[PDB]
């Protein structure tokens, strides 16, 4: 890995955002039986009670 | 548990063949299409308990 440090510390690794931009394409699930996972909500609301 | 089954096996519902599709299943029907790629061949295996 000594000489692999002159590729694992390039930005290229450390920038999903075409990654992200074609998880966007995909869009969401399709199938079924993998429309039981969506349920994650990150929100807004209040932390005072 | 029939739901649960069929997601846990990934194998999906019939989705209600219709009663003279049953006979027509009964008398003999194609139901499975090919797959996307096959390199090695025509897939073949059973089970035994």
């Given amino acids: 890995f000594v000489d692999a ?4 510390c390039h930005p290229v690794l450390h920038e999903p955002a075409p990654c992200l931009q074609t998880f966007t394409e ?14 994650c909500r990150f929100q807004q609301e209040p932390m005072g009670g | ?8 096996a990934g194998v999906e519902r019939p989705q209600l063949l219709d009663t ?4 027509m299943l ?4 194609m139901s499975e299409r090919n797959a996307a790629a096959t390199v090695h061949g025509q897939k073949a295996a059973c089970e035994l308990i």
């Fill in chain 1, 5 to 8: 440090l002159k590729t694992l």
């Fill in chain 1, 26 to 39: 995909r869009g969401p699930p399709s199938e079924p039986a993998m429309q039981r996972l969506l349920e």
């Fill in chain 2, 20 to 23: 003279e599709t049953i006979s």
């Fill in chain 2, 1 to 8: 548990v029939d739901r649960w089954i069929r997601h846990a």
């Fill in chain 2, 26 to 29: 009964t008398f003999g029907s």
